[PDB]
Amino acid sequence: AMTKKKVYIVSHSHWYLPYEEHHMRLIELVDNVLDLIENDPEFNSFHLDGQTIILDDYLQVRPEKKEAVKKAVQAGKLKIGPFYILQDDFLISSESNVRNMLIGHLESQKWGAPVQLGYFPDTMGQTPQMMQLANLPAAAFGSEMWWEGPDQTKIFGLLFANWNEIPSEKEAAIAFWKQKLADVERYASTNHLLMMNGVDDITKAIALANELFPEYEFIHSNFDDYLKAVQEELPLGTVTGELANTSSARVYLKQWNTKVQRQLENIAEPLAAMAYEVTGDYPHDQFDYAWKTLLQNHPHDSICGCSVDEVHRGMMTRFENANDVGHFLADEATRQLTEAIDTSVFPEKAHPFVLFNTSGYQKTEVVTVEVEIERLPFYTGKPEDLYHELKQKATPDYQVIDPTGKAVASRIVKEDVRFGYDLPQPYMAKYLTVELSVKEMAPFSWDSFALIQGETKAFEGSLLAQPATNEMENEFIQVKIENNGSLTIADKKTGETFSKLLTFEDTGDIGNEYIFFKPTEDQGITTENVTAEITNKENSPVKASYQIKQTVMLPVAADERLEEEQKAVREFRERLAQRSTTLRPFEITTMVTMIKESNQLFFETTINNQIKDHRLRVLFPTGMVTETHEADSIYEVVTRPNNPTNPQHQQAFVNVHDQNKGVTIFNEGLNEYEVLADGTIAVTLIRCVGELGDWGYFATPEAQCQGEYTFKYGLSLHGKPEERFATYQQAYSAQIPFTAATTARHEGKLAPNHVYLTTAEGPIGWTAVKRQEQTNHLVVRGFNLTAQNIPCELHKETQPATCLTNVLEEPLTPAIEVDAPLRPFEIRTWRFE
Ligand SMILES: [Ca+2]
């Protein structure tokens, strides 16, 4: 007395090397897949690995086969998508993940492919909500359970595991199958058994398998079918929410990635989206191209910096290209936008310019704007003489004014004289850089100003810094730079004080691109007993800044042993190498900057890294010992607990807080952090290492990160827990500069001051503003930082939003009202028609 079981054999690809070498092999794999599809009528389907890009890469080498490809996708014999590319998810932005799915989706429609499950063959809490917002209610992970995200959004999930190996003989196969079957049924919760078939003669072998077992039916199948079958008979089983040394391998790739992400998501996209109002066009196709290029840097063996030298050089080009497209589109957008602004309101002879808050946040910053002050075309004289004319010429004092004509406090930072050229004409031009203080400027808005000859209206009030003691202060905070060059800070509003901040710490690293490993006898070097050179560089009533220089004596490299232990592939934990006894001076140079209207401190650290096998972090002792901390993640701030080390991955910031106080450290492209047991927040600036690691020996000398680096990060203190979120918002806003463009005096359709979107206040992450693909509907997306139901209402000009959509920009199932509170941890998208 038994019960029958169905075994679903699903064929799929299961497969260090330079890009092209893997690309040529791809061509071969897809050749064979397609050879079976055409030849073997019994062959159900093949699973094309969760990513559409594989067709692109295939067809760019082999375009004649497009017809064969369309056919097999249309007959459901090739199963493609739903992502564009398989992404190293933790490492990239919130939006990059979404955009992967958006592109993946649209590319699947282009093929007439129906939606496949999300596919995760190798390796973030909001995945459940994200998938559902992309209509992927099932996903497969490399036996079956639900996975719920922070929003109580739930997804069905498969734990599959691959357990030509199949024999051609009856006696062998019987035992073979009996054994694989036991392995499958151990974990299975139904009588529907998944059996993955990896590739790199199955109809024959399946039919043998059906001959052999009366209680087992063996069928060549696919995920779609197996999902429908298994879900109807499911009993049990839930997983909830959510090595990090890949976060700090090859920093410069992380820095670049951050930069182009922010260039597309926060600059180019919102500006184009506004420019459409005037122009009636939106460059959908170019954006799509920019994003693909960027996303090609996003796999699980590329952005991690955890591969071979040639591959990462390749990523550098892709980064520059997408960045250049980003800049191009943003430039077009602002030129179209400023041209339409009515600047006739400035007097004759004035030099107008426009500031855009292109983020969703109240922005406060002392900003600089470079304004062209005189221009000499090459047709006026010999260029060298034009240069010297302007360079010799003495410069009038200048005033900035608003549209009403009132004066606006400012400061002239710098004069420059240089060569330039326009469209659509070469010249010499003279430029001024003007400092302006911008305070709580409204999200998604612009203001116009003009530079006019006259007496500069000086900033007024106390100097922020007092250089005699290396101190500075505003209403929010008071700062002392110690002889150390470390900072002691007082929160003027909570009374909490903090000490030893900004200490730098260097240790050896003899691990590899994947993992950090400190030589067994290494105690580390620190700037705690270093004598800093401290200089006040700027002091005004609105902004002050200090330069801190430190020389530490660092080992030049690991000693001689390392290269041998790498060559012998000696396991990293067993390594006897130590820091070298040859020491050289290592210069660390930090700018600490403070502005009147903000509690944030900004740091810029610069090094010229000419030493190897090491790691440099900056520490922020917190004074609070807790079990948990908070880190920025994916559409989410996650609570985590704090191999003796505990490296972790962060986005914009990490936070440690009490019932009474908190410290928020934010960063651009500095993705690894540790929170030490004493409460120190240690951010990794740079990790230098000689090999790839893993299963063999692959020298990666370029992973040593030699050369000049500048790291941007910062600090914010808060009081009672609730104040956390404002610090998080500012951290986002800090990564998004104002855009500044000059224009001529001209009349226009548009106001010189305007709020394009008026946004709801409260703990919300503002994330995308763009337009929809054939529709051109304005798309805006944001997310709830909190576990609470939050009043949220968006307007564009007067106008309210049409509907709420999902991440593919389609209306929600069911229809939630635009008017409705933003649910806990909700990722919301608005459509504006
Ligand atoms: Ca059978």
PDB file of N, CA and C in Angstrom, residues 577-630:
ATOM      1  N   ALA A 577      52.255  34.384   7.509  1.00  0.00           N
ATOM      2  CA  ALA A 577      52.836  35.652   7.131  1.00  0.00           C
ATOM      3  C   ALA A 577      52.406  36.781   8.076  1.00  0.00           C
ATOM      4  N   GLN A 578      53.256  37.791   8.164  1.00  0.00           N
ATOM      5  CA  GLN A 578      53.034  38.873   9.089  1.00  0.00           C
ATOM      6  C   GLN A 578      53.272  40.148   8.335  1.00  0.00           C
ATOM      7  N   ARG A 579      52.892  41.279   8.912  1.00  0.00           N
ATOM      8  CA  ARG A 579      53.240  42.562   8.306  1.00  0.00           C
ATOM      9  C   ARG A 579      54.770  42.673   8.108  1.00  0.00           C
ATOM     10  N   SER A 580      55.202  43.307   7.022  1.00  0.00           N
ATOM     11  CA  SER A 580      56.627  43.504   6.805  1.00  0.00           C
ATOM     12  C   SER A 580      57.210  44.474   7.829  1.00  0.00           C
ATOM     13  N   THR A 581      58.484  44.258   8.161  1.00  0.00           N
ATOM     14  CA  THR A 581      59.180  45.132   9.105  1.00  0.00           C
ATOM     15  C   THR A 581      59.728  46.366   8.422  1.00  0.00           C
ATOM     16  N   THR A 582      59.480  46.539   7.120  1.00  0.00           N
ATOM     17  CA  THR A 582      59.862  47.790   6.435  1.00  0.00           C
ATOM     18  C   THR A 582      58.702  48.786   6.515  1.00  0.00           C
ATOM     19  N   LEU A 583      58.951  49.942   7.115  1.00  0.00           N
ATOM     20  CA  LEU A 583      57.887  50.915   7.377  1.00  0.00           C
ATOM     21  C   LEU A 583      58.106  52.205   6.611  1.00  0.00           C
ATOM     22  N   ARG A 584      57.048  52.731   6.011  1.00  0.00           N
ATOM     23  CA  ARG A 584      57.111  54.039   5.378  1.00  0.00           C
ATOM     24  C   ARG A 584      56.012  54.995   5.872  1.00  0.00           C
ATOM     25  N   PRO A 585      56.240  56.309   5.738  1.00  0.00           N
ATOM     26  CA  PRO A 585      55.252  57.300   6.149  1.00  0.00           C
ATOM     27  C   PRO A 585      54.010  57.145   5.326  1.00  0.00           C
ATOM     28  N   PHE A 586      52.859  57.233   5.985  1.00  0.00           N
ATOM     29  CA  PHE A 586      51.569  57.188   5.301  1.00  0.00           C
ATOM     30  C   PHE A 586      50.712  58.419   5.694  1.00  0.00           C
ATOM     31  N   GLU A 587      50.418  59.251   4.708  1.00  0.00           N
ATOM     32  CA  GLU A 587      49.749  60.521   4.961  1.00  0.00           C
ATOM     33  C   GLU A 587      48.240  60.401   4.779  1.00  0.00           C
ATOM     34  N   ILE A 588      47.499  60.750   5.835  1.00  0.00           N
ATOM     35  CA  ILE A 588      46.042  60.828   5.790  1.00  0.00           C
ATOM     36  C   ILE A 588      45.648  62.282   5.977  1.00  0.00           C
ATOM     37  N   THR A 589      44.790  62.774   5.091  1.00  0.00           N
ATOM     38  CA  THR A 589      44.398  64.172   5.045  1.00  0.00           C
ATOM     39  C   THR A 589      42.879  64.288   5.051  1.00  0.00           C
ATOM     40  N   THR A 590      42.341  64.852   6.123  1.00  0.00           N
ATOM     41  CA  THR A 590      40.900  64.957   6.212  1.00  0.00           C
ATOM     42  C   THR A 590      40.416  66.398   6.265  1.00  0.00           C
ATOM     43  N   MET A 591      39.385  66.682   5.486  1.00  0.00           N
ATOM     44  CA  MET A 591      38.627  67.916   5.613  1.00  0.00           C
ATOM     45  C   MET A 591      37.406  67.635   6.476  1.00  0.00           C
ATOM     46  N   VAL A 592      37.250  68.422   7.542  1.00  0.00           N
ATOM     47  CA  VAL A 592      36.049  68.414   8.362  1.00  0.00           C
ATOM     48  C   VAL A 592      35.354  69.719   8.082  1.00  0.00           C
ATOM     49  N   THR A 593      34.082  69.664   7.708  1.00  0.00           N
ATOM     50  CA  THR A 593      33.309  70.857   7.325  1.00  0.00           C
ATOM     51  C   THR A 593      32.006  70.975   8.092  1.00  0.00           C
ATOM     52  N   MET A 594      31.681  72.192   8.512  1.00  0.00           N
ATOM     53  CA  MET A 594      30.425  72.474   9.215  1.00  0.00           C
ATOM     54  C   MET A 594      29.732  73.712   8.642  1.00  0.00           C
ATOM     55  N   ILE A 595      28.411  73.637   8.522  1.00  0.00           N
ATOM     56  CA  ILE A 595      27.595  74.793   8.140  1.00  0.00           C
ATOM     57  C   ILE A 595      26.600  75.207   9.232  1.00  0.00           C
ATOM     58  N   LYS A 596      26.313  76.504   9.264  1.00  0.00           N
ATOM     59  CA  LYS A 596      25.444  77.153  10.260  1.00  0.00           C
ATOM     60  C   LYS A 596      24.084  76.451  10.488  1.00  0.00           C
ATOM     61  N   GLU A 597      23.393  76.134   9.394  1.00  0.00           N
ATOM     62  CA  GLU A 597      22.020  75.642   9.449  1.00  0.00           C
ATOM     63  C   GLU A 597      21.853  74.135   9.525  1.00  0.00           C
ATOM     64  N   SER A 598      22.934  73.403   9.758  1.00  0.00           N
ATOM     65  CA  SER A 598      22.837  71.951   9.808  1.00  0.00           C
ATOM     66  C   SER A 598      23.668  71.355  10.925  1.00  0.00           C
ATOM     67  N   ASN A 599      23.172  70.245  11.460  1.00  0.00           N
ATOM     68  CA  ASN A 599      23.858  69.488  12.498  1.00  0.00           C
ATOM     69  C   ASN A 599      24.806  68.436  11.910  1.00  0.00           C
ATOM     70  N   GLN A 600      24.833  68.306  10.593  1.00  0.00           N
ATOM     71  CA  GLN A 600      25.709  67.324   9.958  1.00  0.00           C
ATOM     72  C   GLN A 600      27.155  67.776   9.897  1.00  0.00           C
ATOM     73  N   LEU A 601      28.083  66.850  10.134  1.00  0.00           N
ATOM     74  CA  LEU A 601      29.504  67.069   9.832  1.00  0.00           C
ATOM     75  C   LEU A 601      29.928  66.264   8.618  1.00  0.00           C
ATOM     76  N   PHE A 602      30.599  66.916   7.683  1.00  0.00           N
ATOM     77  CA  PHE A 602      31.051  66.273   6.460  1.00  0.00           C
ATOM     78  C   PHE A 602      32.568  66.007   6.466  1.00  0.00           C
ATOM     79  N   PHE A 603      32.987  64.800   6.087  1.00  0.00           N
ATOM     80  CA  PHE A 603      34.414  64.520   6.014  1.00  0.00           C
ATOM     81  C   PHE A 603      34.808  64.046   4.630  1.00  0.00           C
ATOM     82  N   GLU A 604      35.964  64.519   4.203  1.00  0.00           N
ATOM     83  CA  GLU A 604      36.604  64.118   2.975  1.00  0.00           C
ATOM     84  C   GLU A 604      37.994  63.712   3.339  1.00  0.00           C
ATOM     85  N   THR A 605      38.297  62.436   3.175  1.00  0.00           N
ATOM     86  CA  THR A 605      39.625  61.928   3.484  1.00  0.00           C
ATOM     87  C   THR A 605      40.362  61.580   2.183  1.00  0.00           C
ATOM     88  N   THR A 606      41.629  61.941   2.121  1.00  0.00           N
ATOM     89  CA  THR A 606      42.438  61.680   0.953  1.00  0.00           C
ATOM     90  C   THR A 606      43.742  60.973   1.308  1.00  0.00           C
ATOM     91  N   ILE A 607      44.051  59.951   0.517  1.00  0.00           N
ATOM     92  CA  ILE A 607      45.298  59.226   0.634  1.00  0.00           C
ATOM     93  C   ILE A 607      45.840  58.972  -0.761  1.00  0.00           C
ATOM     94  N   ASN A 608      47.145  58.716  -0.829  1.00  0.00           N
ATOM     95  CA  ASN A 608      47.807  58.248  -2.039  1.00  0.00           C
ATOM     96  C   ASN A 608      48.418  56.920  -1.628  1.00  0.00           C
ATOM     97  N   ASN A 609      47.600  55.887  -1.773  1.00  0.00           N
ATOM     98  CA  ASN A 609      47.918  54.534  -1.363  1.00  0.00           C
ATOM     99  C   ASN A 609      49.072  53.869  -2.145  1.00  0.00           C
ATOM    100  N   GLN A 610      50.231  53.785  -1.504  1.00  0.00           N
ATOM    101  CA  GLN A 610      51.393  53.147  -2.116  1.00  0.00           C
ATOM    102  C   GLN A 610      51.922  52.030  -1.246  1.00  0.00           C
ATOM    103  N   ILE A 611      51.011  51.349  -0.554  1.00  0.00           N
ATOM    104  CA  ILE A 611      51.326  50.214   0.329  1.00  0.00           C
ATOM    105  C   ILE A 611      50.263  49.129   0.161  1.00  0.00           C
ATOM    106  N   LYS A 612      50.636  47.896   0.473  1.00  0.00           N
ATOM    107  CA  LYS A 612      49.880  46.724   0.011  1.00  0.00           C
ATOM    108  C   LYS A 612      49.515  45.794   1.171  1.00  0.00           C
ATOM    109  N   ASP A 613      48.577  44.875   0.957  1.00  0.00           N
ATOM    110  CA  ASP A 613      48.234  43.882   1.973  1.00  0.00           C
ATOM    111  C   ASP A 613      47.725  44.530   3.277  1.00  0.00           C
ATOM    112  N   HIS A 614      46.766  45.444   3.154  1.00  0.00           N
ATOM    113  CA  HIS A 614      46.310  46.142   4.331  1.00  0.00           C
ATOM    114  C   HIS A 614      44.887  46.660   4.243  1.00  0.00           C
ATOM    115  N   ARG A 615      44.412  47.208   5.348  1.00  0.00           N
ATOM    116  CA  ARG A 615      43.029  47.667   5.468  1.00  0.00           C
ATOM    117  C   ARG A 615      43.023  48.927   6.308  1.00  0.00           C
ATOM    118  N   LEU A 616      42.273  49.921   5.876  1.00  0.00           N
ATOM    119  CA  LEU A 616      42.182  51.171   6.603  1.00  0.00           C
ATOM    120  C   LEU A 616      40.729  51.503   6.909  1.00  0.00           C
ATOM    121  N   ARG A 617      40.431  51.681   8.188  1.00  0.00           N
ATOM    122  CA  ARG A 617      39.131  52.080   8.641  1.00  0.00           C
ATOM    123  C   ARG A 617      39.169  53.313   9.509  1.00  0.00           C
ATOM    124  N   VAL A 618      38.041  53.985   9.581  1.00  0.00           N
ATOM    125  CA  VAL A 618      37.861  55.137  10.421  1.00  0.00           C
ATOM    126  C   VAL A 618      36.837  54.791  11.465  1.00  0.00           C
ATOM    127  N   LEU A 619      37.142  55.050  12.712  1.00  0.00           N
ATOM    128  CA  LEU A 619      36.307  54.601  13.789  1.00  0.00           C
ATOM    129  C   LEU A 619      35.567  55.705  14.452  1.00  0.00           C
ATOM    130  N   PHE A 620      34.353  55.422  14.861  1.00  0.00           N
ATOM    131  CA  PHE A 620      33.533  56.398  15.592  1.00  0.00           C
ATOM    132  C   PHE A 620      33.051  55.779  16.895  1.00  0.00           C
ATOM    133  N   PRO A 621      33.826  55.938  17.982  1.00  0.00           N
ATOM    134  CA  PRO A 621      33.369  55.389  19.235  1.00  0.00           C
ATOM    135  C   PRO A 621      32.077  56.052  19.686  1.00  0.00           C
ATOM    136  N   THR A 622      31.151  55.217  20.106  1.00  0.00           N
ATOM    137  CA  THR A 622      29.778  55.629  20.271  1.00  0.00           C
ATOM    138  C   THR A 622      29.417  55.825  21.756  1.00  0.00           C
ATOM    139  N   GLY A 623      30.073  55.041  22.612  1.00  0.00           N
ATOM    140  CA  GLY A 623      29.898  55.146  24.051  1.00  0.00           C
ATOM    141  C   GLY A 623      28.713  54.352  24.569  1.00  0.00           C
ATOM    142  N   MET A 624      27.888  53.875  23.640  1.00  0.00           N
ATOM    143  CA  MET A 624      26.734  53.036  23.914  1.00  0.00           C
ATOM    144  C   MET A 624      26.997  51.611  23.520  1.00  0.00           C
ATOM    145  N   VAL A 625      26.897  50.701  24.484  1.00  0.00           N
ATOM    146  CA  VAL A 625      26.943  49.273  24.151  1.00  0.00           C
ATOM    147  C   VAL A 625      25.549  48.640  24.133  1.00  0.00           C
ATOM    148  N   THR A 626      25.204  48.146  22.945  1.00  0.00           N
ATOM    149  CA  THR A 626      23.903  47.588  22.636  1.00  0.00           C
ATOM    150  C   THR A 626      24.127  46.231  21.966  1.00  0.00           C
ATOM    151  N   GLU A 627      23.055  45.452  21.820  1.00  0.00           N
ATOM    152  CA  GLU A 627      23.109  44.203  21.068  1.00  0.00           C
ATOM    153  C   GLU A 627      22.833  44.440  19.578  1.00  0.00           C
ATOM    154  N   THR A 628      22.095  45.505  19.265  1.00  0.00           N
ATOM    155  CA  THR A 628      21.668  45.768  17.886  1.00  0.00           C
ATOM    156  C   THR A 628      22.019  47.159  17.358  1.00  0.00           C
ATOM    157  N   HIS A 629      22.010  47.293  16.039  1.00  0.00           N
ATOM    158  CA  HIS A 629      22.242  48.547  15.371  1.00  0.00           C
ATOM    159  C   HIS A 629      21.345  48.558  14.158  1.00  0.00           C
ATOM    160  N   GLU A 630      21.377  49.665  13.435  1.00  0.00           N
ATOM    161  CA  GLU A 630      20.531  49.838  12.265  1.00  0.00           C
ATOM    162  C   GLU A 630      21.414  50.174  11.080  1.00  0.00           C
TER     163      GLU A 630
END
